[PDB]
Design a protein around this ligand. Structure first.
Ligand code: CL
Lengths: 137, 128
């Protein structure tokens, strides 16, 4: 159960809500310690992922138009194309997703946001394996 | 060893550049953290949008007008691990447990590239 036990619980992951403006999202991103955060609805279902780069790209003028952050909404710029994990029954699919994704969101069958799995657990396992090889030799 | 992303494929900023320029480079480049170099391409620090925005967080507002007043060296992180070569492979994997990437430099602090967690994930996927 090592992949499942490594999930970071949702209440430890900052998020924004549909309808939040981009100035609010930038504040959450800056304080939270994650470079990408989930976008949830009022039922805590997962709709998207947002980063500072997505926000700033949206206000790149012909001048960075920081005044526009007040008016744009997170759903206007968030990424809607993302993988999810719905169970821990398949270790290989999770490891496969972590190749091109630094973390993957965990949701239940109705898309309620549960937490994230990151690459760190796999690095911990590789680290342990390397040390076991030293021990065995 | 063969997985290092070489320095010329990584965007950087230079000492003395302001935070407005750094935000532009960060936004376009596709890396969330980029190196800060000097004229000799020596590594002085690492900078991210979160470091930049934290520096201009007021008690009432995000003070974007201050981006042109601050320089990258004012906000960059200067305490980070590096590797000089691939003569200590166990240390590299050890570092990648708590760091998403580590910079590669030479003895003169010249920036050579970065090693990331992705290559390890690639190997694990292939073994599995
Ligand atoms: Cl990572």
């Amino acid at each position: 159960n090592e992949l499942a036990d490594s999930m970071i619980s949702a209440e430890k992951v900052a998020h924004v809500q549909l309808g939040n403006n981009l100035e609010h999202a930038l504040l959450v991103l800056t304080k939270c310690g994650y470079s990408v955060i989930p976008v949830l609805d009022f039922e805590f279902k997962l709709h998207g992922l947002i980063s500072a780069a997505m926000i700033t790209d949206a206000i790149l003028g012909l001048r960075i138009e920081f005044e526009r952050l007040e008016d744009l909404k997170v759903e206007d710029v968030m990424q809607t194309d993302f993988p999810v994990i719905k169970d821990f029954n398949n270790n290989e699919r999770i490891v496969h997703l972590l190749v091109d994704h630094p973390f993957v969101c965990v949701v239940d069958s109705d898309h309620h946001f549960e937490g994230i799995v990151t690459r760190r657990v796999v690095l911990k396992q590789v680290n342990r394996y390397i040390h076991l090889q030293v021990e065995e030799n």
